[PDB]
Amino acid sequence: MAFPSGKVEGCMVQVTCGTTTLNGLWLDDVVYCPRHVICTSEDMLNPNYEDLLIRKSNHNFLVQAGNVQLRVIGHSMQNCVLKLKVDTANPKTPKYKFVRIQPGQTFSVLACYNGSPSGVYQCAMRPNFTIKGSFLNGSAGSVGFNIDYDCVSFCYMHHMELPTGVHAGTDLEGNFYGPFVDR
Amino acid sequence: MAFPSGKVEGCMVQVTCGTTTLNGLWLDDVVYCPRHVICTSEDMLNPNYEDLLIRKSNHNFLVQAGNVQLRVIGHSMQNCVLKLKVDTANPKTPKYKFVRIQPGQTFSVLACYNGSPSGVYQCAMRPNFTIKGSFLNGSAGSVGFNIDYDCVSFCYMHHMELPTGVHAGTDLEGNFYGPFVDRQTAQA
């Protein structure tokens, strides 16, 4: 059984940089999202994420929570996740922790397409640190979580599909699960 | 494969009558719940629901939405569901409709205990109008639903576990799916 998704639904936003838009997680005054939102159609072969994040402005980021626009007042990169500081804290932030899970352990995924929640799925990571599921197609930035009492433990952020059809992502500190690199 | 449950989680309340507690659905200023909340463990064998309800008053019902108490100002029985009118309207009431589904159609169930959402899962009504699910004691009043754009179609309310370990419920108008009854004696 998947966990109820209401507490996570209230944290999902849309993050746009140029012609890349994907899902982000809005907790307190920070928006977390995959760092490869700063790449374009050519910056995926070999990117210099250090150069790129310096080369971008706060106004180069479009953060929308439904029809509310959020102004980025600063950006940094924690491993493989971009952390966007915004001018207002999420009033719907639940109690949360960031945890790292192991293959075999199940968690719920709230699949989102363009910031809008589509479905809730229970999955588990395979021993190769991948998740099998066509439900994650196009849903980069969707998260995985468990709930204990009143507290949401975020454990996963979807990043990209592999040529093999499987999916790969990080924990909420930007550390990938398994041997993968966003390139 | 389950629908996001946030719209329904904001409608789930805890309903208590005497020593019996189960779940209710709070839409506008009405709470819908299984009528067997007015039964004790002993009453469920062969209860006279009309007689039991006539001896109940509004203050015999305790309704709580999170930590806010909703005072009951009226009650009526519609088939197998009880409709409790409360003194405030749910500000999170979504756009909604009540629908009756058919076997083979899928829907999401939000399993709740004591008014608190516990999990969500997709299921389908089997051809004998039962459902195979993971409900424990206290799950009665959990609801099943589909989402159409922004409209929530409520189609199921859980009522009882059958001797075979499958589950029986009604629609939101209080009519059982199939020939089952909310009592233990003389079940279909």
Swiss-Prot record, chain A:
Active site: 36, 140
Crosslinked positions (Glycyl lysine isopeptide (Lys-Gly) (interchain with G-Cter in ubiquitin)): 85
Effect of residue 137 to A: Does not affect ability to cleave and inactivate human TRMT1
Cell location: Host cytoplasm; Host Golgi apparatus; Host nucleus
Protein activity control: Inhibited by pyridone-containing alpha-ketoamides compounds 13a and 13b. In turn, alpha-ketoamide 13b (tert-butyl (1-((S)-1-(((S)-4-(benzylamino)-3,4-dioxo-1-((S)-2-oxopyrrolidin-3-yl)butan-2-yl)amino)-3-cyclopropyl-1-oxopropan-2-yl)-2-oxo-1,2-dihydropyridin-3-yl)carbamate) inhibits SARS-CoV-2 replication in human lung cells. Inhibited ex vivo by michael acceptor inhibitor N3. Inhibited ex vivo by compound 11a and 11b.
Catalytic activity entry: TSAVLQ-|-SGFRK-NH2 and SGVTFQ-|-GKFKK the two peptides corresponding to the two self-cleavage sites of the SARS 3C-like proteinase are the two most reactive peptide substrates. The enzyme exhibits a strong preference for substrates containing Gln at P1 position and Leu at P2 position
Quaternary state and interactors: 3CL-PRO exists as monomer and homodimer. Only the homodimer shows catalytic activity. Interacts with host FBXO22; this interaction promotes the proteasomal degradation of nsp5.
Free-text function comment from the UniProt entry: Cleaves the C-terminus of replicase polyprotein at 11 sites. Recognizes substrates containing the core sequence [ILMVF]-Q-|-[SGACN]. Cleaves and inactivates human TRMT1, preventing tRNA guanine(26)-dimethylation of tRNAs. May cleave human NLRP1 in lung epithelial cells, thereby activating the NLRP1 inflammasome pathway. May cleave human GSDMD, triggering alternative GSDME-mediated epithelial cell death upon activation of the NLRP1 inflammasome, which may enhance the release interleukins 1B, 6, 16 and 18. Also able to bind an ADP-ribose-1''-phosphate (ADRP).
Name of the protein in its database record: 3C-like proteinase nsp5
Organism: Severe acute respiratory syndrome coronavirus 2 (2019-nCoV)
Taxon lineage: Viruses, Riboviria, Orthornavirae, Pisuviricota, Pisoniviricetes
UniProtKB/Swiss-Prot annotation, chain B:
Impact reported for residue 137 to A: Does not affect ability to cleave and inactivate human TRMT1
Glycyl lysine isopeptide (Lys-Gly) (interchain with G-Cter in ubiquitin) crosslink site(s): 85
Impact reported for residue 127 to H: In strain: Omicron/BA.1, Omicron/BA.2, Omicron/BA.2.12.1, Omicron/BA.2.75, Omicron/BA.4, Omicron/BA.5, Omicron/BQ.1.1, Omicron/XBB.1.5, Omicron/EG.5.1
Activity modulation notes: Inhibited by pyridone-containing alpha-ketoamides compounds 13a and 13b. In turn, alpha-ketoamide 13b (tert-butyl (1-((S)-1-(((S)-4-(benzylamino)-3,4-dioxo-1-((S)-2-oxopyrrolidin-3-yl)butan-2-yl)amino)-3-cyclopropyl-1-oxopropan-2-yl)-2-oxo-1,2-dihydropyridin-3-yl)carbamate) inhibits SARS-CoV-2 replication in human lung cells. Inhibited ex vivo by michael acceptor inhibitor N3. Inhibited ex vivo by compound 11a and 11b.
Stated consequence of mutating residue 44 to A: Does not affect ability to cleave and inactivate human TRMT1
Cell compartments where the protein resides: Host cytoplasm; Host Golgi apparatus; Host nucleus
UniProt effect for mutating residue 184 to A: Does not affect ability to cleave and inactivate human TRMT1
Domain Peptidase C30: 1-188
Lineage: superkingdom: Viruses
Active-site residues annotated for this sequence: 36 (for 3cl-pro activity), 140 (nucleophile)
Catalytic activity annotation: TSAVLQ-|-SGFRK-NH2 and SGVTFQ-|-GKFKK the two peptides corresponding to the two self-cleavage sites of the SARS 3C-like proteinase are the two most reactive peptide substrates. The enzyme exhibits a strong preference for substrates containing Gln at P1 position and Leu at P2 position
Protein role: Cleaves the C-terminus of replicase polyprotein at 11 sites. Recognizes substrates containing the core sequence [ILMVF]-Q-|-[SGACN]. Cleaves and inactivates human TRMT1, preventing tRNA guanine(26)-dimethylation of tRNAs. May cleave human NLRP1 in lung epithelial cells, thereby activating the NLRP1 inflammasome pathway. May cleave human GSDMD, triggering alternative GSDME-mediated epithelial cell death upon activation of the NLRP1 inflammasome, which may enhance the release interleukins 1B, 6, 16 and 18. Also able to bind an ADP-ribose-1''-phosphate (ADRP).
Subunit structure, as described in the record: 3CL-PRO exists as monomer and homodimer. Only the homodimer shows catalytic activity. Interacts with host FBXO22; this interaction promotes the proteasomal degradation of nsp5.
Name of this chain's protein: 3C-like proteinase nsp5
Species for this entry: Severe acute respiratory syndrome coronavirus 2 (2019-nCoV)
Phylogenetic placement of the source organism: Viruses, Riboviria, Orthornavirae, Pisuviricota, Pisoniviricetes
